[PDB]
């Protein structure tokens, strides 16, 4: 069978997903997670659909930026594979 070299599909996916504006996390799991988190602060809360949509948009944008910084940190260490130490360093420099 035909097999692409490792990494080729990785850049193909990189080029594809940077071109689209769709949401990458499934809506129902994120909605459930948001409700579970909000349950700890105030019980019996209701969410407008636009509120959950805004939360998902902000979370995805934040994670994309965090992964950009993580890739920068991993490249700095002469590596291509991102690692938890890269995320930790990126968050530490950001002040989080």
């Amino acid at each position: 069978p035909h097999r692409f070299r490792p990494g080729t599909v990785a850049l193909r996916e990189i080029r594809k997903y940077q071109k689209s504006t769709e949401l990458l996390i499934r809506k129902l799991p994120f909605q459930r997670l948001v409700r579970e988190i909000a349950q700890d602060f105030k019980t019996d809360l209701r969410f407008q659909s636009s509120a959950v949509a805004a939360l998902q948009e902000a979370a995805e944008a934040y994670l994309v930026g965090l992964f950009e910084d993580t890739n920068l940190c991993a490249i700095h260490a002469k590596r291509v594979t991102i690692m938890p130490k890269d995320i930790q360093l990126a968050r530490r420099i950001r002040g989080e």
């Binding site: 990189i14 940077q18 805004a54 902000a58 994309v64 992964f67 993580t70 594979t81 938890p84």
Partner: protein, 80 residues
């Protein structure tokens, strides 16, 4: 509601990384990303719930989320 943090699956993290320009991903990246996502969502939802409670409402509106995000310097357009 319990264990919905596992609802952020490995393909979702991989797609988020691909959108960010990442080429290879380690195994523990998924757990680290779930932790940081939980932290971010906890902060934002705490601020949004505070805004909702102040207005004597029980329904979290989109404007509360917009204000909560703005308070952290992450102003979000398209939901005004």
């Amino acid at each position: 509601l319990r264990d919905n943090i596992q609802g952020i699956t490995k393909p979702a993290i991989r797609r988020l990384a691909r959108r960010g320009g990442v080429k290879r991903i380690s195994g523990l990246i998924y757990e680290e990303t779930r932790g940081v996502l939980k932290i971010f969502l906890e902060n934002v939802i705490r601020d949004a719930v505070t805004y909702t409670e102040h207005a004597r409402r029980k329904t979290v509106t989109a404007m509360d989320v917009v204000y909560a995000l703005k308070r952290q310097g992450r102003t979000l357009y398209g939901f005004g």
